[PDB]
Amino acid sequence: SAPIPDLKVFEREGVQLNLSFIRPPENPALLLITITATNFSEGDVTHFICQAAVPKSLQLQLQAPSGNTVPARGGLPITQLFRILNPNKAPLRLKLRLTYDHFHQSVQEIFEVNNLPVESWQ
């Protein structure tokens, strides 16, 4: 398996979201994306929830996340696995919706992920 580089997709006041990709050779239709949330700010992240969506031609499942909190100052990250099936090799598009609390603010972020590697779907 050739390695596919991680993609940093979001940063806000010290909170970051990062994507990692795996394309198992033994199942070409399959893409496994791991989102990883880190926090280097002075305040905990709480109630973290990530939702995702792909084009209708693809199928998406989310595994339960490792947790809903990311402690301040480089605390334990949250990881969450996305399972995507794409047998027709349609261009991968991915949008994310994040909600969490941080510095006593309710954060709501939604965006389409740009610069997805072609290796994640070809």
């Binding site: 939702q51 792909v54 209708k56 998406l60």
Partner: peptide
């Protein structure tokens, strides 16, 4: 065109 939020 887009699927549901998961």
């Amino acid at each position: 065109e887009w699927g549901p939020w998961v």
